[model samples]
Target: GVEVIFYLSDREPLRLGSGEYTAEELCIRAAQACRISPLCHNLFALYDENTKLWYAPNRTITVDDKMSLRLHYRMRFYFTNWHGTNDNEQSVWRHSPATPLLDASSLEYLFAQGQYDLVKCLAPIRDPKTEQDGHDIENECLGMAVLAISHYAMMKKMQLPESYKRYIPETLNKSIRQRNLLTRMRINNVFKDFLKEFNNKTICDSSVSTHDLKVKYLATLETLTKHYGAEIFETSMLLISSEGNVLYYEVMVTGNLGIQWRHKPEWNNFSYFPEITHIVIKESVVSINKQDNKKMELKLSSHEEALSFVSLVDGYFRLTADAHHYLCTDVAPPLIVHNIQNGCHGPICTEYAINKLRQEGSEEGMYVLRWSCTDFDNILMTVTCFEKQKQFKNFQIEVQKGRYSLHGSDRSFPSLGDLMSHLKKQILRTDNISFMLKRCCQPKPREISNLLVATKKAQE
Candidate 1:
């Protein structure tokens, strides 16, 4: 076998090995070699930096792929006999015919244990391409993690719930395409953090790893039976399986993720960013009946079920908010709900871009998605009350001239469609609208009374 190397962590020591190795043989070899754990299969695991999941030789990649990856990162692996300790020994990482690989850090387990903080930050982007903040290294870091996570799920024979899949290559494409030192610096910060906390010796051809990147990847994995989400359901549910797949949803604002099924795995064999498994459930009944913003419209699946439904249409913004935000949309920099406008019934509404850049302590956007199905259908008119300076402020990405070319289009679509349409395709493609927003602006506000009157008249 080819000489292969891989890391246990992002900035960790390398576990070098050769010759065909079994799951037990490899884990034991890595433990003995790295001096991290003992020699029983009950202890150590191969930590794939790219996937963000830990694995065994039996379930994850083969020696061929592992070595190929090792040629890159020289990453580390974390081993434990159910106690997360490294006494600096060199023996027990093995396997018996009985013990299964215990996923102590799996999303499914951590979430079920009510450990939300650890898993919440696990996924940080929706569409890393069009929606990112133009940082290549940051994109690479996230893109690699997505690959490792999805790849881990695939090796476990788990198919994802029909959402976007393997977006790492696509994200990496967009990231590298938009090279900025700031973005690169951002990634370095996280990398250094990982290094400081865990691995420190591993370096890579990943701009930093060794083996030339693998242009080739895995195929479309099938299902774990139709009873996936049908069995045990949750209100604002976070679904991660025995396989490494992760997904999130709720009754108030979402349905199952469908993008992974609609498109093929990748473009020209390059991978794409994986699907986000965090769902920002609705807080309250959203409506177009601008009469009482607090009134309920959409019935809950069960009583008090609307508890987590985010309330919009009036005072608040974001999936939910406070000094410290909780459920920012899973995209980079995070899209918190700024303002949810009530749309009149039937699919019709203009884009109301909200820019709170310098206005508030934090900065984020709320695209047309702030509109919901409960009561948004009937209440038709509300002018997007930006500072009048951001949107039609004369010089920025003009949103007043109806629309301009955005992602994949030479022409423009006026605004977003109805909430039901959002359910059909729910991966959050906001490059069109995201680019339309103004993040940093001149402190000087612009005059737009005339445009405001015109917009109001148009609304009428």
Candidate 2:
């Protein structure tokens, strides 16, 4: 049988102010609750304003080995501020007749130690049949009672009862009485009308219906709604289950990503729902044969062209043939994407490592080539020039490699000085003679020329 559970911890107790607990302390408590709860696995807990009590999941078990479980949980602290004249005083009277207990110093110490586990231990008792029947119920109950006592004592800023005291444990006894009083008050007054409404319906199995569970959950929600007013649940709702599991939670904001962009001062004050287009390419390249020794070339113009280029490489596979018959085809190339999400945001570059080049004539080419925007920036002009010279050279190198390989006949290729001398008249004829001169005078070309001249001199 599979069981799912969610847990909620009330780091922000109902009666406490907003900054009562540090973020670090809240996180520690949340983590501890997550670690200890049986239903903590596969759960989420969040705070909600609609339901003052944490909305949590109660486990549902199916007999089959396969089970689908959902749990919700939350934690809250209720402070009794008997002296306050504001809402805090009202809140205290709403829950108990005792004088308000609004001591910030006491609460700060209590929360700092992450002692909320004590309250969570008592959570199972709300569903007694399940709690007492579970294998570890007694141990869990005892642990919960101990934590509750220790925490309550700290909150009151008083020493806990002596270990071997004659009286029943004060913390446990007090909590049980408080819980009973609260339940009886709810049943006699608030739930009386609810019970009457339910009485009009037929009685069913003792098992609580999803609707019943929702109603019970909403009791806390109603309190939060009353406090905050007007759909506070959406902003501050967290649901946790019996074993401290979280089922559902959400954070609210006045504006989200799309709204933020549209309302910006730019864009001419005109706004429309953003449109998105997805283009998928299926097949791309033709097969290559061993006899076809010529270098394969493809040209791309637009975004689709780029996508097609990648798809061709990825879609093309290697086929093994036996006795002139195809035996199997294996996918050899990696899947790649050119631009995802309309280039607004996503991976815009593809890279591949080239190791060896298949040599044809005097030039040795790049075998492993990485494709990316940076590569384009470095080699765009060179690749364009290479494309123009392809017909005359009968060989095309993309020059994506930042440096072009030059092969020399008789151990030396032409030097920059020699080439410049030959092209001197042509260089002047060009519209951008100064730019060309600057490019030719660069150290890289000079270094290549110096090496070539040295090698040629040695050969001579």
Candidate 3:
């Protein structure tokens, strides 16, 4: 949700030559380089060459040193929806179905899926000024967008449901206001306390002693006040002090509280960084002891969880160290963990197992259990106890040819009709591939009975 800012400085602009190129020429070259870089896109704002330090609608350029012709550069790009809406704006108008659309539930399900897209398609027609009148549509459209993005992230093995995804337009606006107020309060409180403390402290009449105390007090006050004004000052400080040792403990205990509360798998082989999911998980916890002292702990973990967590916390570190020596590479993906009896498997299978557990509404996150073929054997035997549910719902959309169903089945093999139907719907209306798949596959009652019999026979 944060914008990318770039700053560049040229310490030896004079080396180019006294009269070979002007400061303006150098600035143009730097700007051009940035524009051509892979990261540049329409979402970014570029300042123009303005003399008065004005923030032009574009990138800005100036000569910090006239004689040396030293150039200092800065570039900023905001990340938002590719369709020209901020996360907050999109959240207000996104669409979500009351129930999963079955007919158009597949990745390829187009027509039925497009029905959900109406929010985005009709968004331009809505009155942006009248938030109340169009609030429902805005929320629906934003929901669709969030679902779509989250689905994509999951397929790429990235984490889903980013912080921005959790908010509707109204909620997002409210949160912004609340955050601003809290920030202001923190600053005021810190400043007030610092001043009170400074005044209470005795200062010696000796000039040097008095000056030192005054300087120290002022510096402390400035630092604390600055921290209160920062977006995540407390979080940053915690991270800096964590020193890598207690990071994973904090991540498990504090970072995945929501998952833990919901009873989902809290630990897995890929729980560290190299296996990171490309999403950052932040957790905040508050504890009050009998001493009346309140302590807050914050943890930041990223989807690159497998890589970071594994390297720092597991025996795999030694193996990976030697692996780099021979392979001249870091640990790679598709790492297969095998047992003599069970053959071979990877964390992906564990992910599948967890999805199955979640569908059954079992307590998944409460405990860490080693998953093996034996675990799968037990799961399969008891699978029949769970009810079957449709993984994906269908939807229909109107297109040039005709309407087509968009659902799980449709995704695997889509036709022209399906494509047209899908195009007709708003992009947000489409069901995410992973969520749909997870919903569609359920443990059949009969299958569990058969698995139980097999397990019994194997024991005999």
Candidate 4:
């Protein structure tokens, strides 16, 4: 049996019986279990906390009576500025047709996960510079507790003290340990008064919903934690030289800011930038090449670590740049590769797909191929047809056992490409409007579509 854990405590874990399953299948099930949309499914992955490893989409799992396993479903691919609260920075959002990134359930799960990370010291708070700055951090911690408590109270239809401390970073709690009894009591009193005032006044006055609380909590997380929504790899050595020279460094990859590195000394450091065009893995070394023709070779502790580092950058590239492509083959998702070959898109909404066809020109016979947003086993073909005037039609392509066929058609093909090729040769009739399949309107490199996330750096 396999047990899939979720961050939201209210939701029960997905327990599986004896069978075989792909990681992608389990993720889809997990998403369905949590009511997570198909568009947001790719942002999550199965994680083994004990091993600190993420299961690739193609990884296989065999569940039997003799085997017992636990895997956590986490939203691993993250981009900051998604809440659109920071005015100075450009907001990041999914190019959703209806205007959204995360749905209601995903946001709830993320809020729960954020609280857990803070309590477990996984996402540590940033270091304060001065005495006043440290005090401000403590104050912010109290604010966070208020938000958490308020959220809980509203959801349950809550208070502070011991429960409040559980929402702050563990490091902050440790510092609280050294304070005197009187100081602790004073802080606890402060937290209680704040909570009471917030619950009694702000909750009623502001008409704040659980959605608002979740957004506020996550938005504050960006400022409270060190390099929030960024992944940093501790490299043993970094080689970035123009004339065949070598240097050493510690690398950090972020969504808002591209790839950066600090010279392995607190003494000297510099910055680097990007859209990762290429990633070459040589043993434990990963060489990342940028569009500017500059490159940085990072030597991680092991081959697995190198893959982990490269995959993070690759995932970001897909999120911020091209959704239909991958930077490295080693970690390229199977569905993405198949889409590239078939000229199909990810699970973009029908509106996006129709809009894409409009952009490419509403030329008759031109169609947009995209996965169905509501279903995993279906693809939608939004075609521009000319009955008397220009019109659009949607045809579903059913997928089962790796075979694809048009809905209600006995003819089936082993691949989407084959089916498309066959369709191109014959006439397609829908509602007595006959036409032949023309140009595919393939996904262009770095095209502005709903598939790409609009990040500050990516927008620039």
Q: Point out the worst 10-residue segment of candidate 1 by lDDT.
A: 216-225
| Whole-model alpha-carbon lDDT for candidate 4 | 0.80
Q: Which of 2 and 3 is ahead in lDDT?
A: 3
Single out the weakest 10-residue window by summed lDDT for candidate 2.
318-327
Per TM-score, the best of the predicted structures is 4
Can you give the lDDT of residue 114 in candidate 3?
Answer: 25
All candidates' TM-scores?
Answer: 0.19, 0.16, 0.17, 0.88
For model 2, the superposed segments whose C-alpha errors exceed 4 Å read: 1-31, 34-193, 197-207, 210-212, 215-460
Query: How many clashes does each candidate structure show, in the order listed?
Result: 62, 42, 68, 0
Residue 184 accuracy (lDDT) in model 2: 42
97-182 per-residue lDDT for model 2 (tens digits): 02223233223322332223233322223223564453243233333333344434544555424321111223444554566676
Candidate 3 ranges beyond 4 A from true positions: 1-45, 48-61, 65-132, 144-148, 151-156, 159-162, 165-172, 175-460
Q: What order do you get sorting by TM-score, best first?
A: 4, 1, 3, 2
lDDT by candidate, in order shown? 0.26, 0.24, 0.25, 0.80
